[PDB]
């Protein structure tokens, strides 16, 4: 066995994979959904203007009730915003001010925090004393935490700066599962509806699907030519959208294992920060560095809506579970809700 | 509205007041990030200022509170998290002159001084540090003098032509590091020769921070 022989075998396998993908591509999403009725022009208004942050907002995640939302800013504090009454439910002071990611548990009892600090903090919201306290701290990562999502009240998956992801158990407090398949800095993570799979996109222009119970990777995608920054699972669970700095969103299917269409425009040349689908998945919302948010048609790839309410680069975006509204947070320290 | 709604509004107002108070308390502090290839002067500067992710230290000098930041432990793509440091006040870039002859263990063909110069040029040419002040620190003066007495300086700078004098070599290195900054109008470089006396270094850092604060206050008012 020689390294040159291994490189030749890998090249032959990649050639076989691309040949199979080219041969299996009997049609495309464009020519199939060309007969459906278009989506038309979509216009949304700012329903709620959430103010109170004194630094650039980086992360935001909705809850199960679709009413409370966690928001993280570089000021070093997490804020629990109420959508209807625009009130603050909880103000969690953080030990590390360099927070770039946060997550809301599906039960609404725990919250996550992470960022440039390798230690990931888990806080409890339903404490008996009535005050938010540090539930626990998770250490073991060597790079900055990029994203984190809750699977249940006892397990939580996340990704750090190093080319690996880790799923930890809350009861044990150690690395329950590790994934060292990626070759670049993992920056985006998205759980699947069935909670058995999850997609992770890294800076090496690749997103990989990993199983929670199995542990090994299933498929790999190399449709992007730039560092992938955002990823989101499709509501149906058979696809997922990815957004990188190449100003082009790409929808990859799990069963087809091939890109369908590219969501790009001429005047759009800036990077992408956050992408997600609606409740039905027909609309694809993407935050760009041009201070605007673009809502494209998932089937027609046409610009359905443009939101220019934010004055700074949109950093985080989140659609409610019921699809009633969508919140966006930019570096201007303001959260804006559209519908 | 009900009584619970009024109580929630009062709680939100109290939380907003607490946030404003914390912001006013944190605004008085001046933030200083640290940069430098390898371990040139990280430990030395940390020990002089005091007397696993990001480390932060607080210390008060001349009634001014300093927030220290170090990114020496983040072994990943810097371009993916450097934009978070857009709001910092000062950036202290430390470099060892004695590294003019030393080379990196990863590649013998590249020198440590060239890597430090490339890092400094990349930091200065960053789109997020157009107005951020940079303070250059030169470490190990005595070791550099000994190496100059033992070996010439032209071993790393073929275009250099001058006497093997510590003052001339230091001036040439300072000019070479200052010429890497293309934004001479908006970016200012504060060169200083660090020594064993930590008091002088702390005083120079305080004076530089004062000058940068004055310049920022004059620019915000539209006067400078």
């Amino acid at each position, epitope marked *: 066995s020689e390294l040159d022989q291994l490189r030749q075998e890998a090249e032959q396998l990649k050639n076989q994979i691309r040949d199979a993908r080219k041969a299996c591509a009997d049609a495309t999403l464009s020519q199939i959904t060309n007969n459906i009725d278009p989506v038309g022009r979509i216009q949304m208004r700012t329903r709620r203007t959430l103010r109170g942050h004194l630094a650039k907002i980086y992360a935001m995640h909705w809850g199960t009730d679709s009413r409370l939302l966690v928001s993280a800013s570089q000021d070093g504090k997490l804020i629990i915003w109420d959508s209807y009454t625009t009130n603050k439910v909880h103000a969690i002071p953080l030990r590390s001010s360099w927070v770039m990611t946060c997550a809301y548990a599906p039960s609404g009892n725990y919250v996550a925090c992470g960022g440039l600090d390798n230690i990931c903090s888990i806080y409890n919201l339903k404490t008996r004393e009535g005050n938010v306290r540090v539930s626990r701290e998770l250490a073991g990562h060597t790079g900055y935490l990029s994203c984190c999502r809750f699977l249940d009240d006892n397990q939580i998956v996340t990704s750090s700066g190093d080319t690996t992801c880790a799923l930890w158990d809350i009861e044990t407090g150690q690395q329950t599962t590790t994934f060292t398949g990626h070759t670049g800095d993992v920056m985006s993570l998205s759980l699947a509806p069935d909670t058995r799979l999850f997609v992770s996109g890294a800076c090496d222009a690749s997103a990989k699907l990993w199983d929670v119970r199995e542990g090994m990777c299933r498929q790999t995608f190399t449709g992007h030519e730039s560092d992938i920054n955002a990823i989101c699972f499709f509501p149906n669970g058979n696809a997922f959208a990815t957004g990188s700095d190449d100003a082009t969103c790409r929808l990859f299917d799990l069963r087809a294992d091939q890109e369908l269409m590219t969501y790009s425009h001429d005047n759009i040349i800036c990077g992408i920060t956050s992408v997600s689908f609606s409740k039905s998945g027909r609309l694809l919302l993407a935050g760009y560095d041009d201070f605007n948010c673009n809502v494209w048609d998932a089937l027609k790839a046409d610009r359905a809506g443009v939101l220019a309410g934010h004055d700074n680069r949109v950093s985080c975006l989140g659609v409610t579970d019921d699809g009633m509204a969508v919140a966006t947070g930019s570096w201007d320290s303001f959260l804006k809700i559209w519908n | 509205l*009900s009584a619970e709604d*009024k109580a929630a509004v009062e709680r939100s107002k109290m939380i907003d007041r607490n946030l404003r108070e914390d912001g006013e308390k944190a605004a008085r502090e001046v933030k200083l990030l640290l940069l430098g290839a390898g371990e040139s002067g990280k430990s030395t500067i940390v020990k002089q200022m005091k007397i696993t992710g990001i480390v932060e230290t607080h210390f008060t000098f001349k009634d001014l509170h300093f927030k220290m930041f170090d990114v020496g432990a983040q072994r990943s793509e810097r371009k993916k998290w450097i934009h978070c440091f857009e709001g910092v006040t000062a950036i202290i870039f430390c470099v060892a002159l004695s590294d003019y002859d030393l080379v990196l263990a990863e590649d013998e063909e590249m020198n440590r001084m060239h890597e430090s110069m490339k890092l400094f040029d990349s930091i200065c040419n960053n789109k997020w540090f157009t107005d951020t002040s940079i303070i250059l620190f030169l470490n190990k003066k005595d070791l550099f003098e000994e190496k100059i007495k033992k070996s010439p300086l032209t071993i790393c700078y073929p275009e250099y032509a001058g006497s093997n004098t510590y003052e001339e070599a230091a001036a040439y290195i300072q000019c070479q590091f200052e010429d890497l900054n293309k934004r001479k109008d908006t970016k200012e470089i504060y060169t200083h020769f660090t020594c064993s006396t930590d008091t002088k270094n702390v005083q120079f850092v305080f004076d530089a921070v004062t000058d940068v604060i004055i310049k920022n206050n004059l620019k915000d008012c539209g006067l400078f």
Partner: single-chain antibody
Amino acid sequence: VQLVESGGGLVQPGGSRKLSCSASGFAFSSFGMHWVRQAPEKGLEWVAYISSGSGTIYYADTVKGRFTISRDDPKNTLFLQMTSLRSEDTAMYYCVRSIYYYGSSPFDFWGQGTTLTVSADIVMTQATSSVPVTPGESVSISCRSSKSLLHSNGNTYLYWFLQRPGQSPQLLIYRSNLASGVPDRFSGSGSGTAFTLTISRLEAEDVGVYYCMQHLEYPLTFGAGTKLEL
């Protein structure tokens, strides 16, 4: 958490008395404080309420001008000054904590309280006062209100309190919404006017008196309370 009350005893008519309350085990500056009085062989009655930072203070329409409530946040203490006590003010007072937010549970912990012996709005009215029940059957206490508590937001402001002889009242339901620390056997139903509290399985620890409280406005008014003997 612990709430130690002090200052009760015998007071001559026309005098003054400063009741003190020390809180521990939680953030005193985060929870709003309420005073609940209970007369011998009678029901409960709200006295006064104070919020965090003394920004919102309310008193009962009957004791306006006489009672004065204050709080020490750096010391985590509550003080209640009572002047010109009448022959009716003889009762047992309890200090209750309550926090208000989405998904909270106000009036969750009741203090021990202390006794004091001297010498148009919404009112809750219960049809029954004592229902004999044997172990094995179910319990269903009905209640009727004079005003529809169904506010425009859609939240039902109804609180159930189970007081046991010798112990402090325990919160069962704060809003259908089951509270923490209580079994799932208790349930609440009904419309905005009529309410019904049902018990799945009646155990030996569920005996006591049930009181209903409304929280649509600041002036509170407890019901008659249904007592269960077993």
